[PDB]
Chain length 304, copies 2
């Protein structure tokens, strides 16, 4: 029990435009309470867990500020922070961050990581923005996240938290090998990823799920780290979001997986010393990195 | 797939034979080895393959398991490429109109000294050598370590390759190579994806520790890394084992051909000489290069500096 933590993945069901924010927060607390009762010490919530997935709707570039969080915590979210601290449970929470930095207003897709004592460990701002900047008439559903958020300015950080090394990424970050590699090069042992993944109706749903798990399982094994992937899933205002929340061991094995598209808690005991094990041995076999052969990864953006 | 998996000949569709090998023991003659590769090449020709992928170090036993002077394994190295013993393979390939990739131990006079590389060569249908890759990631250790159940002395007999991960215009598309445990490194696939690679050829020798298990985990890991590298760089990946029991040391099987979706389209079923074949539409690589993995539109290199400023 030296560096073991019981982790709950708090998958969420659909949030519609018609849901009250008070009732959204109530659902987060209910999941946080179930996690407490199951002995969890850390709870992972989805990306943008405090609203409907509004990137699917067309509006002015600043016409979505009503979904964003004034502060963190603010009046709407303070009940969740207070319940978590009272229960002695840490969490990571995704939200849409509105902030005044260098005079102007900035918009970030953000996850904040809060420790068992209720102190904010840190904050990751989404690097890889999916979707498009403008209405796309040939699409069945819009994805306009690019139109409403700026590229984050935190980098992929890894913090001393929960007895180990903990990092965060957001949604489609999880398809870029660089996302996990950057944090593995900082000795990450637990990566927390909330996501909203639109599903295209009619199959290719199974291939989407395959790719969802494939990228996280490979990130976990190839950087000898735990990976928690938590969905906001289900049908929001006619738009299906993918389920498939998982907790993944540094072996790349899935050790817990959601079975619904609704609010659902998955639990696993995560031994962080298992990450140290695979990273390096006294009699080991893994060659060392040869970055002199990797320069294209930072010297170009697209293909040659 | 529960259907016939082959597809007829077509522009930009390439039929690939994965030529998995069984064990090569220390007591095998060189002719016996070459004749076995020629047999797989003829098998691949009778199935209409235009490209045959051979394993890493396909011309000898996996000699890194044994201890000798640092120049004491040079007798397993190829003098030239081709040489007197390997010329019949090139002659067969040229005559049948089949290209191939071949792993071997390369002994070369260059820069004034003797250099030793773990190497794969890509040979076009016309018989011409079109590219060479020299293994970058050398696994194992440099000196005899008696606490180990088996030795893995690759760092002792090979130098770090000086080619880089190259991608060539070949076989109607963009072809790259890697070797064995290169395939565990996301950088291997990504560096070639940044060169618009459509087909990565990887031969390998993967020792398996004496089990009973976690043998299924080693197989899971083997396929996980190639499937992910394929999908996340929107490229075909061919991984070809030398497998079986060489002089009491077991080598992993599981050769596969993997589509740019990350799906396995062909898989070996034995641990001997075996041919797997799949028809590979290189245009299928635009499936994810158009949007999901459009590198120019999505990558943010200013946040990846640790990957090139690292160990």
């Amino acid at each position: 029990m030296t560096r073991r933590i019981r982790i709950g993945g708090a998958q969420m069901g659909a949030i519609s435009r018609s849901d009250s924010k008070k009732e959204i927060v109530d659902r987060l607390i209910a999941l946080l309470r179930q996690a407490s009762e199951k002995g969890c010490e850390l709870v992972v919530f989805p990306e943008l867990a405090l609203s409907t997935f509004f990137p699917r709707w067309y509006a002015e570039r600043d016409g979505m500020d009503g979904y964003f969080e004034d502060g963190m915590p603010n009046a709407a979210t303070l009940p969740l922070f207070e319940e978590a601290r009272r229960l002695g449970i840490g969490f990571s929470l995704g939200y849409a961050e509105l902030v005044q930095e260098d005079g102007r207003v900035r918009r970030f897709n953000t996850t904040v990581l809060v420790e068992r004592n209720g102190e904010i460990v840190g904050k990751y701002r989404k690097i890889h923005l999916p979707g498009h900047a403008e209405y796309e008439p040939e699409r069945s559903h819009q994805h306009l996240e690019k139109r409403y958020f700026e590229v984050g300015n935190t980098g992929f950080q890894v913090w001393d938290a929960f007895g180990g090394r903990v990092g965060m990424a957001i949604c489609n970050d999880r398809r870029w090998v660089e996302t996990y590699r950057v944090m593995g090069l900082q000795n990450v042992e637990l990566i927390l990823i909330g996501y909203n993944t639109p599903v295209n109706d009619s199959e290719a749903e199974t291939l989407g799920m395959f790719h969802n798990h494939l990228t996280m399982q490979a990130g976990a094994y190839q950087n000898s780290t735990w990976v928690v992937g938590v969905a906001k899933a289900g049908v929001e205002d006619g738009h299906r979001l993918m389920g498939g929340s998982v907790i993944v061991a540094p072996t790349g094995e899935i050790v817990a997986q959601a079975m619904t598209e609704g609010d659902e808690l998955i639990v696993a005991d995560c031994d962080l010393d298992r990450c140290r094990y695979y990273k390096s041995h006294i009699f080991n076999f893994a060659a060392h990195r040869r970055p002199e052969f990797y320069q294209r990864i930072t010297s170009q953006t697209g293909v040659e």
